[PDB]
Design a protein around this ligand. Structure first.
Ligand SMILES: Nc1cc(C(F)(F)F)c(-c2cc(N3CCOCC3)nc(N3CC(CO)(CCl)C3)n2)cn1
Length: 803
């Protein structure tokens, strides 16, 4: 029927068909679809239709000190469309509009699908804080509120565990053996192997693998990890399914192949390529502490998330678990001290979680919550108390952590989890969260066979509750990016390689962009407030980068938009943009951290969205150019950069503002990059705006600690009065990140596992970079040594890349 045409629209939006059962050996996925219906409807029938349509973007956080100093009269001016209006920072939208008349009209931002509404001071609106920080005037049009009817939704034993290894099969390709692990949170409970047989296209064993664990000692979420060594292939089977039933019967599991640790290795999904992939065939038929110990316990609790716990430490934590329960910071280490392979201990663990008044009353610590949601915890009861703390996150904070909460779904043992349901709720409650939730989920569905099925089921559940209006937006957005990505590919084939630009390329590009325009208006995926109209064909070009990316520019479809600037987007194939997304988001989290301490390092975390395999889109920051390109124009010469700034800034005052913007923006990327270990970059990959705002680009796949070349130093003048500022802002910013050391360490390690090509040694860099277990005095001295290395080295590393 027509209801089945609705499901075909969902499939096109998703990029995957969730009704397909071609790759399932149980009904867990469908069971989850049905299970997600409840949380969907509960959030739909509970959200306010009015605020849902206007979707006010608001924060409950305080107004930073560096923004108060920009309003030195306690008078915020709002230009309504037109007379300017004197307003107090604590003036509510209603008190402003009623003061405007002296009835149901609403204030909407010019050139944006954004609204300033609700019981909140204008001081607490994100669009207002943006205008203030960037010294812009708040322009708004008195418009009629969007029809809430547009958001309407289409209503809907003591025996040891045994495994029978029959054999492996592959029509492709030493000696191989089968290793079967019983795993829980990457903790190998017991391990058994087969005998090494000749590696042929068919290898049968017909052997029972005896494990040391009993059947009723198997914890929920425990994985049967089956691996082949010559390690070339792996595959997993949940031993207890979504119905708490011990898994039994025959299985033919198509395994994933290894390339020559990370989240993919954990998935319960089987390889969908049954034609080429290796197969496996199996059979299942079944007082209080003394002073000295308390100090040792507290010392253990105080260490970082990456500090390994010894057997003694674990035994200590467990025996004094009720003492450890009083410290929320002890929870990650405590639950790592649990013998999950023992039913009795798991029981005591649950009774311990029964009364958790301290944990329930503690202030929300995201860094501590994330640690409970990573690969080290499979127990759903432990993970639930994590998602519990997330519930107190305001929408502004959900957006901060959305990308890596979505990635964290990869660490969930089952498809239907508290973490999934949480994202679903918060996505249906806020259109901005829902919008980015769509693109984050869709990003993984398109280039991850390991998790596309789970993410698809989740995306379908969101799409059925977001409302008919947003379904229309997503469809337009999807249709446009599909057209543009086609043009991106065809143009890449024509240029080939070793040719900067051809006459025939500029011809075909402007030809296809003309043909393609005959998609009236689409929402900008990386900036959902902005809508894009007709292409500015004359501005469109191929940038002549290594991959020949498209430089496209559009017109804003909003006539109320004051300016006439175009919306720029770069389409690129060849780079894995999922890595740039993760880095950029961490940059935003660093900005957020710095805001807590009234800092502003002027980072420019541009918009970036992965849409497919090595393909996606990148926001174009206006009036920006490469620092290396600035050297090629006049020429190695260090005087150049300051010369370029004077040229672009007409007034002498605007120039000093650029140098102020520079010393700030410079310091921000110095600290951020070193902490993340991406500071040693080529001059080409660093850009600057005409207003002196420095920023890095292209974070995919990445000797000096970072980049502070003499050309940058010349802009500072060198010791100088503003270099003293630079050395000052860095230590302030650096020591500020160390105050959130645990949060940064967990996000970093998660970024490596869920988005990078990843062993223990890789993560430990950020720990050293953050000077773990060091005094603030010594740490400040550490970072300054790093600054001096950029001085002593000069262009030594800079010149090297030229080969
Ligand atoms: N993974 C990637 C890929 C790209 C690339 F566009 F494909 F090259 C970029 C990037 C962004 C950018 N930005 C992003 C911020 O807004 C301005 C454009 N400018 C450039 N340039 C290459 C250049 C060399 O001179 C061509 Cl004109 C400038 N490159 C970043 N990350």
């Amino acid at each position: 029927e027509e209801s089945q045409a609705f499901q075909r629209q969902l499939t096109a939006l998703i990029g995957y068909d969730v009704t397909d059962v071609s790759n399932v050996h149980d009904d867990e996925l469908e069971f989850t679809r049905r299970g997600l219906v409840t949380p969907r409807m509960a959030e739909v029938a509970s959200r306010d239709p009015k605020l849902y349509a206007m979707h006010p973007w608001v924060t409950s956080k305080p107004l930073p000190e560096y923004l108060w100093k920009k309003i030195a009269n306690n008078c915020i001016f709002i230009v309504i469309h037109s007379q300017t209006i004197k307003v107090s920072p604590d003036d509510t939208p209603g008190a402003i509009l009623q003061s405007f008349f002296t009835q149901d009209f609403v204030l909407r931002v010019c050139g944006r699908d954004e609204y300033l509404v609700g019981e909140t001071p204008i001081k607490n609106f994100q669009w207002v804080r943006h205008c203030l920080k960037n010294g812009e005037e708040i322009h708004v049009v008195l418009d009629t509120p969007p029809d809430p009817a547009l958001d309407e939704v289409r209503k809907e034993c003591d025996r040891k565990f045994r495994v029978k290894i029959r054999g492996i099969d592959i029509p492709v390709l030493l000696t191989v053996f089968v290793e079967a692990n019983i795993q829980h949170g990457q903790q190998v409970l017991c391990q058994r192997r087969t005998s090494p047989k000749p590696f042929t296209e068919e290898v049968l064993w017909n052997v029972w693998l005896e494990f040391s664990i009993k059947i009723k000692d198997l914890p929920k979420g425990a994985l049967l990890n089956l691996q082949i060594y010559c390690l070339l292939y792996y595959v997993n089977l949940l031993l207890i399914d979504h119905r708490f039933l011990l898994r039994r019967g025959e299985y033919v599991l198509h395994m994933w192949q290894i390339s020559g640790f990370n989240a993919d290795k954990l998935t319960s999904a089987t390889n969908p390529d049954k034609e080429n992939s290796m197969s496996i065939s199996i059979l299942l038929d079944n007082a209080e502490m003394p002073n000295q110990l308390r100090k040792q316990l507290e010392a253990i609790i105080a260490t970082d998330p990456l500090n390994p716990l010894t057997a003694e430490d674990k035994e200590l934590l467990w025996h004094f678990r009720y003492e450890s329960l009083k410290h929320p910071k002890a929870y990650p280490k405590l639950f790592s001290s649990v013998k999950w392979g023992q039913q009795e201990i798991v029981a005591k663990t649950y009774q311990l979680l029964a009364r958790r008044e301290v944990w329930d009353q503690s202030a929300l610590d995201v860094g501590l919550t994330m640690q409970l949601l990573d690969c080290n915890f499979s127990d759903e009861n432990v993970r639930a108390i994590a998602v519990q703390k997330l519930e107190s996150l305001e929408d502004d904070d959900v957006l901060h952590y959305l990308l890596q909460l979505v990635q964290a779904v990869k660490f969930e043992p089952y498809h239907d989890s508290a973490l999934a349901r949480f994202l679903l709720k918060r996505g249906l409650r806020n259109k901005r969260i829902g919008h980015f939730l769509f693109w984050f989920l869709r990003s993984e569905i398109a280039q991850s066979r390991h998790y596309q099925q789970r993410f698809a089921v989740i995306l379908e559940a969101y799409l059925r509750g977001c409302g008919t209006a947003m379904l229309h937006d997503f469809t337009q957005q999807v249709q446009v990016i599909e057209m543009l990505q086609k043009v991106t590919l065809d143009i890449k084939s024509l240029s080939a390689e070793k040719y900067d630009v051809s006459s025939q390329v500029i011809s075909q590009l402007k030809q296809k962009l003309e043909n393609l325009q005959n998609p009236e208006s689409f929402r900008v995926p990386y900036d959902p407030g902005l809508k894009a109209g007709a292409l500015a064909i004359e501005k469109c070009k191929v940038m002549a980068s290594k991959k020949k990316p498209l430089w496209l520019e559009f017109k804003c479809a909003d006539p109320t938009a004051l300016s006439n600037e175009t919306i720029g987007i770069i389409f690129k194939h060849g780079d894995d943009l999922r890595q740039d997304m993760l880095i950029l988001q961490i940059l935003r989290i660093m900005e957020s951290i710095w805001e807590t301490e009234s800092l502003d390092l002027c980072l420019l975390p541009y918009g970036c969205i992965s849409t497919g395999d090595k393909i996606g889109m990148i926001e174009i920051v206006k009036d920006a150019t490469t620092i290396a390109k600035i050297q090629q124009s006049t020429v190695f010469k260090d005087e150049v950069l300051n010369h370029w700034l004077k040229e672009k800034s007409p007034t002498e005052e605007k120039f000093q503002a650029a140098v102020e913007r520079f010393v700030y923006s410079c310091a921000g990327y110095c600290v951020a990059t070193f902490v993340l270990g991406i500071g040693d970059r080529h001059n080409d990959n660093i850009m600057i705006t005409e207003t002196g705002n420095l920023f890095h680009i292209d974070f995919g796949h990445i000797r000096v600690p970072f980049v502070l070349t003499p050309d940058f130093l010349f802009v500072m003048g060198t010791t100088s009065p503003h270099f003293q500022k630079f050395q000052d802002i860095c230590v302030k910013a650096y020591l500020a990140l160390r105050h959130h050391t645990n949060l940064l360490i967990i996000l970093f390690s998660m970024m490596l596992m869920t988005g990078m090509p990843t062993s223990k040694e890789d993560i430990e860099y950020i720990r050293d970079a953050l000077t773990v277990g060091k005094n603030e005095e010594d740490a400040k001295k550490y970072f300054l040594d790093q600054i001096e290395v950029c001085r002593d080295k000069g262009w030594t590393v800079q010149f090297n890349w030229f080969l």
